[PDB]
Design a protein around this nucleic acid. Structure first.
Ligand SMILES: [Mg+2]
Ligand SMILES: [Mg+2]
Ligand SMILES: [Mg+2]
Length: 221
RNA sequence: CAUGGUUGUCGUCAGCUCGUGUCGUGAGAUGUUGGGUUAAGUCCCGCAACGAGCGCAACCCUUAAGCUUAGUUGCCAUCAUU
């Protein structure tokens, strides 16, 4: 990426000074209109490191999980993950998604079973009330577990659009020692994330640019 | 007041719990709370919970309406008769 591209994206924009995290001071360049401005020069170097890492994991064939429950990133996470053929979560992070994957795995299997029953044509045989509730279960499973249906093993890396929003995802990854690549805004804390990209996560344009670049690395691998 | 079996009672009240995960030094907690909703821990939505079980409900019996099958010991409209 280039600084001009980043400036157009709105990556430089940051949260209000009051809501900042002091640990991210290095990344901050200046304060304008009561908003800290991310240093793009640091961002470009950071983007490169994460891009290299994601290409490396993709070269190894390691799976990557994209998390963007934030409204801005929901659409971007879905599209880029599909492009790169990687797992995504854009609705809600179920507690114990990775730590309790033994239970979660069964829920993934359930989605296939519900489809199988429809394919079998048991659905017509089943009582209407039972078929309605079965459909409702399936839709709920698709809503939350749709992105990771294909996943059968722990993702080699996680991509998080907003670490502060996705606290549970960060915690589970750190417990399981999974490397984290994240878009960290001024408010967020960078210590937890292994690969930190300092950027605005409140802009659809900004998130899309960064997630696309990461997807490209996965595509390259 | 050594017991099995059987029973009353709170109360047919909507509870009571567990596995895995997570949190807590720990006893614990979460789930099971919250916003609505229901007869209902009923259901929905949200939510470090994700699920599951015993309860709830439903399946059963009886009662309130038809159809088809059958018609004696039941019934008698169509007629004779008593
Ligand atoms: Mg209780
Ligand atoms: Mg229940
Ligand atoms: Mg009952």
């Amino acid at each position: 990426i280039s600084m001009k591209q980043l400036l157009e994206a709105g990556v430089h924009f940051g949260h209000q000074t009051r809501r900042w995290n002091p640990k991210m001071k290095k990344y901050i360049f200046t304060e304008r209109n009561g908003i800290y401005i991310i240093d793009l020069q640091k961002t470009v170097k950071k983007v490169d490191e994460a891009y290299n890492f994601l290409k490396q994991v993709s070269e190894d064939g390691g799976q990557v999980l994209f998390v963007g429950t934030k409204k801005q990133a929901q659409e971007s996470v879905k599209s880029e993950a599909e492009r790169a053929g990687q797992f995504y979560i854009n609705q809600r992070w179920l507690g114990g998604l990775l730590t309790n994957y033994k239970t979660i795995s069964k829920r993934i299997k359930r989605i296939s079973e519900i489809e199988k029953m429809e394919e079998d044509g048991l659905f017509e045989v089943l009582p209407k009330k039972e078929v309605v509730e079965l459909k409702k279960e399936y839709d709920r499973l698709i809503k939350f577990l749709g992105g990771i249906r294909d996943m059968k093993s722990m993702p080699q890396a996680l991509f998080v659009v907003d670490p502060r929003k996705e606290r549970n995802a960060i915690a589970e990854a750190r417990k399981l020692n999974i490397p984290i690549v994240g878009i960290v805004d001024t408010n967020c804390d960078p210590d937890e994330i292994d690969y930190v990209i300092p950027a605005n996560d409140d802009a659809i344009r900004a998130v899309k640019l960064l997630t696309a670049k990461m997807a490209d690395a996965i595509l390259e691998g």
